[PDB]
Each structure stands twice: as structure tokens, then as C-alpha cells.
Amino acid sequence: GRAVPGLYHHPVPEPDPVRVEEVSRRIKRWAEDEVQLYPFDGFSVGRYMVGCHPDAPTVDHLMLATRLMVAENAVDDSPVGLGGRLLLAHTAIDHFHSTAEYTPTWQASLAADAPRRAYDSAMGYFVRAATPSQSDRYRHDMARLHLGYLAEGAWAQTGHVPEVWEYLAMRQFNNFRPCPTITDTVGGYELPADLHARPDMQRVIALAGNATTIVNDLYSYTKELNSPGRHLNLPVVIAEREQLCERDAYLKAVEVHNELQHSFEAAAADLAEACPLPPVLRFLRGVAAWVDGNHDWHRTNTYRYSLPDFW
Amino acid sequence: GRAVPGLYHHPVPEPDPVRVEEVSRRIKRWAEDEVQLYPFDGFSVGRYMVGCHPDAPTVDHLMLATRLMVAENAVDDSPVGLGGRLLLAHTAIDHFHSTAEYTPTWQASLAADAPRRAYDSAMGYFVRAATPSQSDRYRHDMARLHLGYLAEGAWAQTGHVPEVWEYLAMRQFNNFRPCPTITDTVGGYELPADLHARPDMQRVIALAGNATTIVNDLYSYTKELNSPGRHLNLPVVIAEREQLCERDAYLKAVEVHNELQHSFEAAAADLAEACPLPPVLRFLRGVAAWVDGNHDWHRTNTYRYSLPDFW
Ligand SMILES: CC(C)=CCC/C(C)=C(\F)COP(=O)(O)OP(=O)(O)O
Ligand SMILES: CC(C)=CCC/C(C)=C(\F)COP(=O)(O)OP(=O)(O)O
Ligand SMILES: [Mg+2]
Ligand SMILES: [Mg+2]
Ligand SMILES: [Mg+2]
Ligand SMILES: [Mg+2]
């Protein structure tokens, strides 16, 4: 249950057990009764989402994020035909438009497997609740994610080890980013689209996702040593390119995380000063909350993750 | 110089020769002196862009679209590592954010090849001219395009022939769409982001891109018979799945185009009535103009394209 030594992070309060438990039961019923996601603890994802969205006004708001997070996972369920699989699944998020003949056939494919059932349903709820701007913004962040996956899968098909910055670029896209960027939707307000689009806000979001995603590299490092092949993460890539020992490579990855997290904070503090509108200040706080909550989930989840003996 | 018989389209005026010629010279200088795009007629792309953007206030506005269209092409210059290549090129469009150590190395990669030089420069000009909303919107349409490419490349690696609707879904993404959706930027006004994001506007745009992209399937069909392997387009896919003769499959593809184009028009007429704001009405007209101009460019370009003897 201990943090990575030297990892810069913020502790968080225990997540409201009443909420965790309610999310768990509703998420189990959705998975089983609505989308037949299998022929998985609700508790894991409930602690995750309650911890990451402390400002959600209701469990209904929390369930917007929870179903999308679970659907994200159903999709990870060779890489050779990945680009075709992911494109079709993307249509459950950004709909196909076609003729009266071909539309119904696409429509049937949305029931065809767990990942597409999961997405069609989870997105369905999101689109009813969110503004059209918040929906479009999510589709863009999902198109990023799928691109990230496809870079990673392309490298895996040849065992290619990218340069460190190249791995970092992939991991900018193959990245938690679609989760914190729905903080406004889940918080019951809107960050206006013209403000989301500012270059400074875009930089704040990218840094945040980049830091909180390297958190996962650091906590899941030991588990990934057993993944098929040579599964890439920042320590592994640093070690291989910068020809360092595993230990020093990992410690450097911790320092990289720290600089990304510190830069995220400085960038958010600056935007808060430059543009102190309420929906901006709340969004910035919710992104930091999602980030702190994501570190806490990784830290406490000793079922999935464990630490290397480098200290 | 003849249209596909039975293809529903709108004729267009001859493109202003003064403008075509000016675009050609400036685009040749950009390619040669700014981005070293080779160690290509300016005239082809000039007729293309003047024809597609009759409302551009200046050649500077036209050159925003022209450099992006040319950069798009430099990128098409096995599919196995495609997802890694395209991700890195995407960073020239949607920037990498990283540490003081890794940022400069990424920064150097932007000069490394023609495609990334082309994008970094072309996007550079776009970002200075457009609103932050118009920039974000372009990055999303480019992330769509790259996903489309990667589906197509994944299928090509196994010679997979998708179902027709599946091919159509890919071709929704691997699609001209980033070109007409910058019509406002090129026209010197803005479609507001909240209005762009409406589901009805999203459907109008998708149909338009879907029709004008099947135009390219129909005009480039004969050329593609010679592409390495079995290059997919709508007639080829219809023939193979619906086991039809090449001719009848092509004629059906013409009917599919016609229904997409008619549906695009009905959908735009409806939105124009539901929401008759000026920036909406102008954007709708500019999308139709881009679509009509794209058909005319395909029709007149007998250097790249020619027709099957099916009539
Ligand atoms: C948008 C969502 C929900 C997830 C984004 C994808 C990411 C970053 C992960 F799944 C975590 O990395 P990884 O794939 O290495 O996961 P594990 O280490 O836990 O297996
Ligand atoms: C955004 C831009 C500029 C282009 C989108 C990609 C598309 C649809 C094409 F290049 C045309 O199809 P295709 O690849 O079959 O081109 P050709 O038939 O002319 O070789
Ligand atoms: Mg993964
Ligand atoms: Mg991991
Ligand atoms: Mg192509
Ligand atoms: Mg073609």
C-alpha cells in the first residue's frame, strides 16, 4: 500500500464508502444486465471513480465516467488487424452515417460484442447528459487514445523499441486523458468549448495526462515484466535506449514523472491567474483531483500492482 | 473530361486563372524553399483549391488549405509500422508536451522528413490564422483521418476484404473531411464551436465527406486496379462481398454516392431552416462548394484519373 519512493504526489481522503458501494452495485448491474460484458470488482472501479471525482453531484454523474472507464477496458480484451477492430469500435463513439441500406447493418454490429455494446451504451448515457461540445471533446480524446494504441501495436508487431521521447509521444496519446477531461461533465457544469480550446489549456491537459499516465508505468512495471514479449513502459525504454541498468532507468522514470507533474501544476496555476473564470478554475481543480485520485488508486491496488525492490 | 454517367453532381464555373496561377507559384516556393518537400504541378492543386473555396477573401486564405492538402499528400509518400509513423507525424499537428530534456529531441524530429516538415509548417500557418476552436477542430478531423488510414493498412496486411458497410465506415474516416471542414477558416469567418458540435451539423458534415470521398472511389477506380495488391474501393468491395460483376458493382457504387449526396443536401437544407444564423448558412454553403469543387477537380483531372467502359 506504499507509494513509489520519491514520486511527487498528493494524498487524498478515503473515498465515501456509501458512494463506492452504490457505484459498485449499479456498475455490476449495467455490465451484466445491460451490456452482457461477460458470459472484475465493482468495488475496484467504484473506489477509482469516487476517488477521482469528489465533486460529482450524484451517483448518476459518477456512473457516466464509470461505464466509459469499464468500456475502455472491455476493448483491451496479434495486433495485426487492430486498426480495423478499433475503427469499428470507434463508430460506437462517433457514429457512422450512411444509406438506408448500410446503416441497419452497422447498427446491428453495435450489439455484436462486449466492447461495442459497452461503448454504445456508455456513450449513449454520456451524450444524453453532456453538452454537444462535451460529447465532441470526448470523441476527440477517444480518437487520440485509439491512435496511441495503434502506434503501440505497430511497434509490438516488430518488437521495435522507440527512442525515449518517441515512447513518451505515444504515451501522450495512449493515455488516461479521456478520464480527467470529463471532470466538468461529471461535476455538473461546463468548461466552455472556446476556453477548452485555448493552447494554454491544451498544454495543461496534456501534461496532466502525461504525468498521471507515467504513474501507471511506475506502478505496473513489475507486472509488465510478465506480459507477452517485451511490453514497453518508461523504465524499460530508458534502460534499452539509454543502456542503463533496470534500477537506474526506473529511478530516472520517477524523476521524469516528477517534472511532468510539477510542470502540470505550474501550468494550471498560470492559467488560473490568466483566466480566473469559475468554469476554468473548477475544471483545473477537477483535473488535479482526477490526477491525485488516479495515483491513490494505483498505490492502493495491490491486487493488480506491486513495486520493484529498488530502494 | 466527362463526368461518371449517372453521378449526381453540380457543375461549377471555371476557377479564376489569376488566382490559380498565384496559388501555383506560392505553393511551389513553399514546397521548395520552406519545407524541401522533394530533392507535382502547382497548377493541379491551385485549380483544386480555387475551385473548392470560391469565397476565399485572399490567396493567403487559399494557401492555408493548399499547404495542408499538399502536406496530407507528402504523408501518403509495408503498412506494418504505419501506426508508429503516423502517430509521430500527428505530433506535428497536435504538439508533444514533455520535459526540458525530451522536448528538444521531439522538436528536432519535426525537421526530419518531408511529411513532418510539411505538417509543422502548414499547421504553423493555420494556427496563426484560425481561432483556437478552428485549430482544435482540424486536429480532431486529422485524428479521424489517421484512424481511417490505419484501418485500411491493417486490412491490407492480411488482404482482408471487409463487408461493404465496414469498408464504408473506414472510408468515413479515411476521407476528404478535413478539407471542407476548414471552409470557414478559409472564408474568413467562424462557425462557432457550439454550433459545429450539434449532432445535426455533425451528420451533415459526415454525409458530405462520405459522398465526396466516394467520388474519388468512382474516378480513381481504374487507376487502382494497378495499385499493389487488391486496393479497396467501393466498387471492388461490393463486387467481392455481394459477388457481383465489376460493372454492376460499380454502377451500384454510383447509386450509393447519389443517395449519400442527396442525403447530405436534405440534411443541410433542414439545418439551414432549423438554425438560420449567418455563420451556419455560410458554412453550409461552403461545404457544398467544396463538395462540388472536389467533383469538378476529379472530373477534369485526366492525368490521374480515367473512366471504366461500363456505359
Ligand atoms: C482511458 C483509459 C480508461 C485508459 C487509458 C489507457 C491506459 C493509459 C491504461 F489502460 C493504463 O496503461 P496500461 O495499458 O499499461 O494498463 P495496466 O498497467 O493497468 O495493464
Ligand atoms: C485530407 C486529404 C487531402 C485527403 C484524404 C484522403 C483521401 C480520401 C484521398 F487521398 C483520396 O482517396 P485516395 O487515397 O484513394 O486517393 P487517390 O485515388 O487519388 O490515389
Ligand atoms: Mg495498455
Ligand atoms: Mg501499465
Ligand atoms: Mg489513399
Ligand atoms: Mg482513390
UniProtKB/Swiss-Prot annotation, chains A, B:
EC number: 4.2.3.118
Class of this enzyme: lyase
Record has Signal as a keyword: no
Essential cofactor(s): Mg(2+)
Catalytic reaction annotation: (E)-2-methylgeranyl diphosphate + H2O = 2-methylisoborneol + diphosphate
GO BP annotations listed: terpene metabolic process
Keywords: Lyase, Magnesium, Metal-binding
Function of the protein: Catalyzes the cyclization of 2-methylgeranyl diphosphate (2-MeGPP) to 2-methylisoborneol (2-MIB), which likely involves the intermediacy of 2-methyllinalyl diphosphate. Is also able to catalyze the cyclization of geranyl diphosphate (GPP), albeit with much lower efficiency, leading to the formation of a complex mixture of cyclic monoterpenes, consisting of alpha-pinene (6%), beta-pinene (23%), limonene (32%), gamma-terpinene (29%), and delta-terpinene (10%).
Family note: Belongs to the terpene synthase family. 2-methylisoborneol synthase subfamily.
Official protein name in the record: 2-methylisoborneol synthase
Origin species: Streptomyces coelicolor (strain ATCC BAA-471 / A3(2) / M145)
Lineage of origin: Bacteria, Bacillati, Actinomycetota, Actinomycetes, Kitasatosporales
